[PDB]
């Protein structure tokens, strides 16, 4: 998977407003091939359908939040390595180590600006050789 404008990402976050926000931010990057998530389950369901580049998700969201979220997909054999950006209004430092140490690729804190969520993608992009 590279980071070129066929790269699939899904958005989930329990609230629309945030899904509409990520997903226009990623299209203003040259980025159209983006899916919505509404909880951490949903997602699983279309992550396992396959062909996905890129997980950006939320924190706190019922039926499975996004730490168990991450915390599947890095122990999932067929996706372990996926790219997963966290977006959350969570700021403590031991909510960042779980998810640091859960294996997350980036970490933005809620709100964040278009700059900031550019330059913590493009780090990731660097880090993984998309
Ligand atoms: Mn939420």
Same mark, same amino acid.
């Given at each position: 998977? $590279? ?10 976050? =329990?609230? %629309? +407003? ?23 389950? *949903? /997602?699983? !369901? ?10 950006? %998700?939320?924190? *706190?969201?019922? !039926?499975? =939040?996004? @730490? ?7 122990? *999932?054999? /067929? $996706? %372990?390595? @996926?790219?997963?950006? $966290?977006?959350?209004?969570?700021? #403590? #430092?031991? !909510? &960042? &180590? /779980? ?13 964040? +600006?278009?700059? +900031? ?6 780090? &990731?992009?660097?880090? @993984?050789? $998309?």
């Amino acid at each position: 998977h $590279m980071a070129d404008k066929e790269l699939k990402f899904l958005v989930v976050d =329990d609230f %629309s +407003t945030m899904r509409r926000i990520v997903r226009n931010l990623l299209k203003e990057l040259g980025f159209n091939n983006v899916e919505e998530a509404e909880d951490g389950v *949903d /997602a699983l !369901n279309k992550l396992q359908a396959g062909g996905y580049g890129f997980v950006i %998700s939320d924190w *706190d969201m019922p !039926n499975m =939040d996004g @730490l168990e979220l991450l915390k599947t997909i890095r122990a *999932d054999g /067929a $996706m %372990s390595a @996926l790219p997963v950006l $966290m977006v959350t209004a969570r700021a #403590k #430092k031991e !909510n &960042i &180590i /779980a998810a640091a140490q859960a294996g997350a690729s980036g970490y933005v804190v809620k709100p964040f +600006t278009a700059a +900031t969520l550019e330059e913590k993608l493009n780090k &990731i992009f660097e880090k @993984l050789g $998309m």
